[PDB]
Amino acid sequence: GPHSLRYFVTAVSRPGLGEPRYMEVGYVDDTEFVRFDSDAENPRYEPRARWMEQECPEYWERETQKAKGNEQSFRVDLRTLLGYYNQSKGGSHTIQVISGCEVGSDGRLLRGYQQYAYDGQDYIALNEDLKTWTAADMAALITKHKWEQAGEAERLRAYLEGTCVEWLRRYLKNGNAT
Amino acid sequence: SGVVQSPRHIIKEKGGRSVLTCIPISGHSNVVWYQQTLGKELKFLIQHYEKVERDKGFLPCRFSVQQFDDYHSEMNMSALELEDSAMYFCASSLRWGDEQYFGPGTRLTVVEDLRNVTPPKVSLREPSKAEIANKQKATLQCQARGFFPDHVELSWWVNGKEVHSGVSTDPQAYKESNYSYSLSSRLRVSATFWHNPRNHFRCQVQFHGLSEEDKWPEGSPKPVTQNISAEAWGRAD
Amino acid sequence: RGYVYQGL
Known part of the structure; x- marks a missing residue:
């Protein structure tokens, strides 16, 4: 995959002493270019590359809204996985999700992935067929069942086959020197 | 007691236009449109939660959907092409992430x-x-x-x-x-x-x-x- | 752009 676009999602939980530190980081190829961080005084999707500094101003509002929604979504999951695993309500935890698509020279999708991980250990992931899930333990079987009845596989597939490739093609155009 | 889709079958001339409509289960707030082409597959199109778009993918700019006050959503389809001839399904979960209930689906065939x-x-x-x-x-x-x-x-x-x-x-x-x-x-x-x-x-x-x-x-x-x-x-x- | 993560 000569060109890939990834996203690292981290929701480190702190039971006491505050709320979960949530942040999203993306890398066109292997270079960081955007970043979000909950533990900022006024959090906003900020660029980390000169070619992203010139992007549309409405782009930053569109993504910042989406992150805060993902922040609230993952705040519920942190609580849910304490009920799945029957864990104590006062232990620090971490959910790591890496999403991304790498494309070849031909511009078509080579492989898309989405790997969830709870406290370092793999939780669930989307298979190479982009239609089926592969769960790692009994609780992940519960989550896998939800996403199957919800249809999450079709939604995520459409993101990697479509949305991820078009915006990576768009990011590389911005990336090249003006 | 089930999701209603209408009409079930329509034949449209290339470049024409027709609207697809879908009545979700009463009380459901999450509607989502799927397109399935003649070759076996399922393509995610749009998701509308509580009258607003939530996630979008694969939905062409020619197609436009919107929810209404009674939560029923319609899909406006203009400038139809032969490649648009497919089956269009409408699932409606109660909340986002909840179990979705599909509809009968609309069979659209665009003819020259x-x-x-x-x-x-x-x-x-x-x-x-x-x-x-x-x-x-x-x-x-x-x-x-x-x-x-x-x-x-x-x-x-x-x-x-x-x-x-x-x-x-x-x-x-x-x-x-x-x-x-x-x-x-x-x-x-x-x-x-x-x-x-x-x-x-x-x-x-x-x-x-x-x-x-x-x-x-x-x-x-x-x-x-x-x-x-x-x-x-x-x-x- | 980034995925719209929903519940699990």
Whole structure:
């Protein structure tokens, strides 16, 4: 995959002493270019590359809204996985999700992935067929069942086959020197 | 008690436009449109939660959807192309992430010329005298051909009752020409049953053609939606 | 752009 676009999602939980530190980081190829961080005084999707500094101003509002929604979504999951695993309500935890698509020279999708991980250990992931899930333990079987009845596989597939490739093609155009 | 989708079948001319509508389950707030092409697959199109778009993918700019005050959503489809001919499903979960309930789906076929739409020709042929004598198991072939587009649903009716036991309809329609398809189905019957001259066999073929709103140049009957059937009685020899 | 993560 000569060109890939990834996203690292981290929701480190702190039971006491505050709320979960949530942040999203993306890398066109292997270079960081955007970043979000909950533990900022006024959090906003900020660029980390000169070619992203010139992007549309409405782009930053569109993504910042989406992150805060993902922040609230993952705040519920942190609580849910304490009920799945029957864990104590006062232990620090971490959910790591890496999403991304790498494309070849031909511009078509080579492989898309989405790997969830709870406290370092793999939780669930989307298979190479982009239609089926592969769960790692009994609780992940519960989550896998939800996403199957919800249809999450079709939604995520459409993101990697479509949305991820078009915006990576768009990011590389911005990336090249003006 | 179920998700309603309408209309079930529409035939539109290339470059035309038609709206697809979907009534979710009462109380449900998450609607989501899926498109499935003729080649087996399922494509995510749009998701609207509480009257606002939540996630979008694969939905062309030509298509526009929106929820209403009664949560029912409609899909505006303009500048239709032949590649848009597919089946469009509408799932409606209560909340985002909850179990979604699909609808019947809308069968849209975009055709180049509306004049090519033509009802089928249904004819069933009685089983061979050779096979019934050797196997005592009669097979009734039914032949529906000469129709366009592929909007037929074949069913068998013995003694006035629709039967699924013993029938074996072809899985897909076989396109003979560019603007004429053909479907075949065969129903097996025991020789003692078929030899009873009191049994009525009927192979009906439902055809979904032009709508009444679609104008029709005269000189020929409008290919309106209709089911035509070929029947035959049992024979003894 | 980034995925719209929903519940699990």
